[PDB]
Design a protein around this ligand. Structure first.
Ligand SMILES: *C(=O)CCCCCCCCCCCCC
Ligand SMILES: *C(=O)CCCCCCCCCCCCC
Lengths: 41, 604, 109, 604, 604, 41
């Protein structure tokens, strides 16, 4: 968790972060991308 | 428009012939219609996300813009000169072949790159269920981190780049909300790149889950149109192909199946014994057809299959009648002159071929399992073929014993090894079998309530019955799945049937005192168990004597209901019992909050 | 490099494990075979005794191994290679690297 | 916008009422949103492709441009006056009803036309696997052609139009690259109309296949939300409906199932015999309840089903105790006064109803199979109904024998025909059964590690256990399928569990010398086999005494992990073992190249 | 473009670093690409439809326009500053986070609202199958209505709002055509809001149903790429993971399985008996290894599973040899010094551990079922673990009896309880087993035609054979399903094989008089049954001695054919037997018209 | 394979044609076209 600084807009050990799931936003990316012949074209 | 772009090779005037696929040093520009950009953007979007990990590890090569693989040509774009002429597109966005190659191998190369990291991020992310489905629940970040600082095995990649993975993560888990730099506090809202998608997957308390209930429907709709559940009780010849019979090899236990319970199996019900002889491999053996009726597989009405009679664990009393020992058990065909069930004595049996004997007598195939010597699991096995039995009116497959010397001891034995678990496997799907005949088409409606209790369980692997059972079984999972035939909700299924019972019981009341006005509360409930009994055991609808289900209306009725029923579910079909379902989800989040509470204490 | 045309496997071939699922009709152990016998601290004849059979199993028709045996003479080079006779071994640049060897006849048979 | 187009019937001012579906002599113009043109274009595109075969055979009628079925009207387009008011579209592209009819029956008529040819092109195309998945591999064209000139059966259509099918083909198989006219050489690149789609299906060596790995994920995601795998171990009442129990009729072998191993089956464990009598069809028979305990199906705790006790292949010793022969075997209910397992003698048994006897005594139902006469496969069968047993505290279903005259011979026999394979089929899904009671809702978490080894295999068709098994089984195929719970990749599944074991073993260490710092390498590995043992045999998680798996955390944990795990797979999940998978594909192309080499020689 | 919108925080010049996610008091504006508006419009469209029922019941709140949740911001929109820089969008349409919340919970709240009504509309709609699939068929409206006025149970919602539901209905059922107000007659055409979708689902007589045939293909394509049917007979090491083995616990009947028919089970074939002893729980018992060979589960070659040997219904002759009674049956390991099958007498057996005994002797576990006392269904059960047997060259699992005192009576008994149905369940998927060895990778092609008839049925749960069977089984359902391997249509599958037989039989003819020019009509037909026999019983392709199917070419061939075959089906694949299929649908509509005719009379 | 000439831009027996699969372009037309109710509209 050693401080980084700019590589990415957020530090992990950064000030006031917060793990907190909300039944509202089910985390996630994009797995079901459609590529099948007819559907991709 | 769609397809490759064409341009007037003859110049200016573009007619249905002065065109030509505009190919060249780069390959052929194929048009990139609006939606097809959604994919390649959605694919690249999921890669750009991992930007912070690409720089950290010096791989990658900058963000992949889809606008680097395309171009802005213009011409007519179709599938053929003729139709491409009606799609004049100006400055459209096409991707050349050689480009359609990179956008491909790039998304592929990068896809590997991320697929790997993305796997490490996960063993760490899911390693603390960042997903609840009712209300919220936090877990003081310090602890959480100081905790995974442990668990995570020394070869992850979330320990070598914490806030290089964290930045990738924040965009995939709206659970982790990064603390804002200039107020040093969270954000309430969580902004993960999958903003919308993640919003529309949350188990919305009003109705289960749109992403779920939506698919469980389109899924059922697929089947309904696919297999051909529609037309399930159609009354007219249908090619077996229409039933896509596959992976279909059913096994039995003959020498038990009554002859009338399944046409493909006749028996030698004769007074005395019928000892015959046959020179097999020099040695002369005697087929017995002993004391009892000895049910034998008939050859006609036997779709050229792969009969494999297994004889194992079954008793082998060579201990008592010594006559039995020494005889090599073997599946043998038996051509009889007079039709079986009319074949009295030896002179009646034309010939007997040992289609497959078992090397080594009955005293090596044995194995003592507490007195009663059993049969060492072995499989005898013919390969019956429709025409190898051409002309031959009577012929039967019999898995008997072939005694090397009949005696008084084997005078009440009857060596039929048919008590074994025989497994016929139709080796030529095109041809089915029904009521004892081989056909190429079934008549569905005919097979309904036409079999008896066991004229079904005794069906022959890939025969109308077994086909008109494999079919109902699909339709049975479409209702079982999509439609709610398992609650007091008088669903579309049990509803289609109720309307039949009414129209039916209503005309049976016409003419005569009509002293009984139709019931309805009793009809709804009777049809509810009818539709329910179907989903339950799809088969039943073939057995003579099943209430409601077996009248010609139903099924033909049911399906066409269930049919339109799926084509309207809406999206929020999940509203059914979405109350207890909800209350159960809150139940879980309360227990999972309990977990985070320990992660929060133990590792302070 | 095109995967189909060029493949790369990590780990040594001296270890039995490495040989699982690697089938090539021809192997070439030039510049290594000598260092493996030394690395695995084993006898040169005994080493190739376990490698050759692996190449046979690996499905190999041809083989080329830069083995270091004095077939012409047991005479050595003053500065390039010293042939310690007490223990079948070489000394390329006397020390810089030491690798065991075999004899023309024994290794041949 | 979407829906039918509307226009201000009252003119000019368009309010939420001065609108009206602009219908007319052509039907109603429905708007053709951007994406819906993708389909009808993608459908027509696949037909235009067959242009060279339409002219050759004088069918067809020119290329079908989708711009021939639409129009360029303009107005407000919504689903209802109210909402259509917020979609003012100018010169949008709508298709009138009567047109939505042709674009339909045209694509249908043409679809037949091509579907046929397209089938001939195929039996010839695939008739030389034009598809490899690693590196390349040619096959000198001359040979190839001169070869198929043979194989292809005289009724194809690829022999009547070679380069009329070839031109259609070139656009579907980027394997066949036509030789360019003005350089008389191939092209390196292959330009088939499916340019992109075909590029994105190739098994990319970096990661298996995007089209594969992508679906195997969306597929699993469907299930995860659908059936309701989420909430799999929820601790709170859930309507049986929430378990979509269908096609669910399990069969047993009672008279063997211990009473405590499955509440729905009590036994008459009494000292002597309990010969009772009953006038059935005039004749008076004696039910026995012989020497042994005679386990009988209890009626309460028996969800109104369709009990069908089959008695076949099972021994029938009428040979010894002649008493047994003559007695028609029959399933009979038995109402007892005092509760069974307390019912001592005949005067205790209230009454006995023959719910289903077998016509013809025990000497016609037999069939000698080597001394030991068996039972000709026959199915006795009641239709128990919840309420037909109202009030009646004690009543049991018993498939006994009904001896026409008890004797000394049958003094150690005990005629329970229950040794036969009974098959109960719940005929009314809404009601389930648990621990002996009939309910309408289960409490999942309760059924975990609460059954014993066989308090599971002895479950009653459609009872909590059998439901909390049908459920885990889905979730078991989502992990088995999508997640890699079968390699040393400490996947998201076995990872969710590891975090529980830690948090668990960590607090059990709190308070007292804490001499053992948690392990982790041992925990990861212990949870790996825990998640693995689950995917393996989903059932186990119900049996008391299973390591890890049966603690309340897991499962509730697992699923919610596997859950989020699927909702992030990326696309290149196939990167797993995409090395040996790749090396295996090259292995095939090397062998297939070997094939083309013979096609290339034999037919020069 | 896609993703959240960004804007130059540093103003004017946007440098790819200046850009920052334009967040604020509303959350972050995420772009709403063209297609993503199709969904939210298609979702809202399906809700607006229910407008007439929202007003009637004072719920709702006006029509939901998607243009109420979005905005018209403008900036650069990407997934990360770097890539967002290449998507300058002006006045695009973005939806802010807090909005992505309402459009969500609104569509959710409304979705419940309608989901309910929509359910009532249905029990009434499908309650008169408004869907036929061939020709038309009316049912005079008066009757119809006056009829449902009955059937519909008093708690619907179609009785409280007839023409408030009717108006919703008219848009979902193109069956109900409302009578036009100013000509008081129908319309011929029916204009339901689903105008197009409903047009493209009708079972078009030219080809079954586009919606069906289309999916049955994309469905098969999914599998083909997914599981990895491709590469099905690859000749090279493949991680078991590549076979996604799940829910895989097969059960047997050893003490019958010949040792050579399945490596994981050796037998003590020794002359006399081998009575050994062992102090188990104080009491000293004698393991027997009686008269016969006593086949025992070998421990090596036994993937650390969960062996659960069930002993029930199986004979228990404590009646004769009293020696048997009193002995607690129990599964026991047996470590022998000299390898079994070479272990002669007691001094040879190193030690014997009772890994799981059954409390209570053999006279409480019994239960008389007609003389022959059986075994009360009980499950003994070890939990074998790869390494608990490290070093130990010889050790065997044996479910024997443990007699408390061997006697002359048990001199021909042999107490092996293995005749019971043992059920091994691999508890650690990563490791498979082949030919007796434990491995981590299979070599597919090796397992083809390498097992014998029963060297397959005797396979050990999750062993190469059982894996190279679970695999073919998928590929078997893709062909069975999509491809027409069940009609005389010499399909792509049976075609791929024919080309192999030719190329094969053609070179076998090369060199020597070549007196036989290849056949073809006979080859087509031989390969047709070969491809057919495969779809039929996928397994066979593992058994040595199966015509065609087992030559190295086929399968590797088949699949790669079936492969490309699915990737071209077109859409109108349903044209196959679309004639009888059609004629069967007209058959149903003629019978359903017959129904409407009664609804039309009875309730005038 | 008899020469045609113009019906279609390519002769089958034409000069320098070439059957040659490439693992790169898996031949495929359009089978999976989506038409299901919700998805077609
Ligand atoms: C420094 O690296 C100390 C360890 C703290 C984080 C390491 C990885 C565990 C937490 C993951 C954060 C990113 C998403 C899980
Ligand atoms: C003339 O027609 C001689 C036969 C050569 C081609 C006939 C059909 C076989 C080759 C098919 C080419 C088009 C796609 C397979």
């Amino acid at each position: 968790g050693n401080v980084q600084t700019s590589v990415n807009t957020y530090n992990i050990t950064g000030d006031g972060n917060s793990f907190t799931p909300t039944s509202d936003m089910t985390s996630t990316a994009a797995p079901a991308i459609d590529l099948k012949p007819g559907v991709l074209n | 428009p769609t397809g490759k772009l064409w341009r007037p090779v003859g110049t200016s005037v573009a007619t249905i012939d002065s065109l030509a696929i505009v190919s060249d040093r780069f390959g052929q520009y194929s048009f990139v219609n609006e939606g097809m950009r959604e994919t390649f953007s959605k694919a690249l979007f999921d890669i750009n996300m991992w930007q912070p990990l690409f720089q950290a590890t010096k791989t990658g090569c900058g963000p992949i813009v889809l606008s680097s693989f395309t171009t802005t040509t213009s011409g007519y774009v179709g599938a053929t000169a003729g139709d491409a002429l009606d799609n004049p597109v100006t400055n459209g966005v096409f991707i050349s072949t050689v480009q359609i190659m990179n956008l491909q191998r790039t998304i592929a190369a990068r896809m590997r790159d991320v697929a790997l990291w993305q796997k490490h991020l996960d063993t760490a992310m899911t390693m603390l269920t960042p997903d609840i489905s009712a209300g919220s629940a936090s877990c003081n970040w310090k602890s959480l981190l100081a905790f995974a600082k442990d668990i995570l095995p020394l070869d992850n990649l979330c320990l070598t780049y914490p806030n290089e993975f964290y930045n990738v993560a924040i965009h995939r888990y709206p659970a982790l909300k990064p603390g804002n730099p200039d107020t040093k506090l969270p954000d309430a809202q969580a902004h993960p790149l999958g903003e919308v998608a993640g919003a529309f997957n949350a188990a919305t308390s009003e109705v289960g889950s749109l992403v779920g209930s939506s698919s469980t429907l389109s899924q059922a709709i697929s089947t309904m149109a696919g297999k051909d559940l529609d037309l399930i009780e159609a009354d007219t010849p249908l090619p077996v192909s229409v039933f896509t019979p596959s992976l279909a090899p059913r096994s039995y236990r003959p020498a038990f199946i009554k002859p009338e319970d399944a046409k493909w199996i006749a028996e030698f019900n004769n007074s005395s014994l019928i000892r015959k002889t046959l020179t097999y491999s020099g040695a002369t053996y005697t087929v017995q057809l002993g004391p009892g009726p000895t049910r034998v597989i008939d050859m006609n009405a036997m779709i050229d299959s792969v009969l494999t009679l297994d004889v194992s664990g079954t008793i082998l009393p060579y201990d008592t009648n010594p006559d039995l020992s020494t005889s090599v058990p073997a599946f043998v065909l038996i051509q009889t002159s007079v039709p079986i069930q009319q074949v009295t004595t030896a002179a009646n049996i034309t010939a007997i071929t040992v289609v497959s004997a078992a090397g080594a007598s009955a005293i090596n195939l044995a194995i003592n399992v507490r007195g009663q010597p059993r049969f060492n699991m072995l499989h005898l096995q013919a390969t019956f073929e429709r025409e190898t039995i051409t002309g031959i009116p009577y012929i039967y497959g019999l898995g008997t014993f072939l005694i090397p010397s009949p005696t008084s001891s084997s005078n009440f034995s009857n060596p039929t090894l048919m008590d074994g678990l025989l497994t016929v496997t139709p080796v030529l799907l095109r041809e089915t079998t029904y009521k004892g005949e081989v056909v190429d088409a079934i008549v569905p409606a005919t097979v309904m309530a036409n079999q008896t209790s066991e004229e079904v369980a005794s069906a022959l692997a890939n025969d109308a019955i077994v086909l008109v059972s494999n079919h109902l079984n699909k339709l049975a999972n479409v209702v079982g799945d999509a439609i709610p035939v398992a609650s007091r909700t008088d669903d579309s299924a049990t509803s289609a049937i109720v309307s039949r019972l009414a129209v039916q019981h209503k005309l049976s009341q016409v003419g005569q005192a009509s002293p009984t006005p139709p019931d309805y509360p009793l009809l709804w409930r009777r049809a509810k168990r009818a539709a329910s009994m179907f989903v339950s055991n799809p088969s039943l609808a073939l057995q003579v004597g099943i209430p409601v289900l077996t009248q010609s209306g139903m099924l033909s009725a049911l399906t066409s209901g269930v049919g339109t029923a799926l084509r309207t579910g809406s999206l929020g079909k999940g509203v059914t019992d979405a109350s207890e379902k909800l209350r159960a989800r809150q139940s879980l989040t309360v227990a999972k909050q309990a977990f985070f509470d320990q992660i929060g204490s133990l590792w302070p | 490099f095109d995967p189909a045309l060029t493949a790369y496997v990590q780990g040594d071939y001296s270890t039995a494990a490495f040989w699982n699922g690697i089938r090539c009709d021809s192997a070439t152990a030039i510049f290594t075979i000598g260092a493996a016998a030394a690395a695995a601290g084993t006898d040169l004849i005994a080493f190739v005794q376990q490698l050759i059979p692996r190449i046979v199993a690996a499905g190999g028709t041809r083989m080329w191994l830069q083995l270091n045996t004095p077939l012409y003479e047991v005479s050595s080079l003053p500065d390039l290679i010293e042939i310690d006779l007490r223990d079948h071994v070489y000394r390329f640049n006397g020390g810089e690297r030491v690798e065991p060897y075999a004899d023309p006849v024994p290794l041949q048979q």
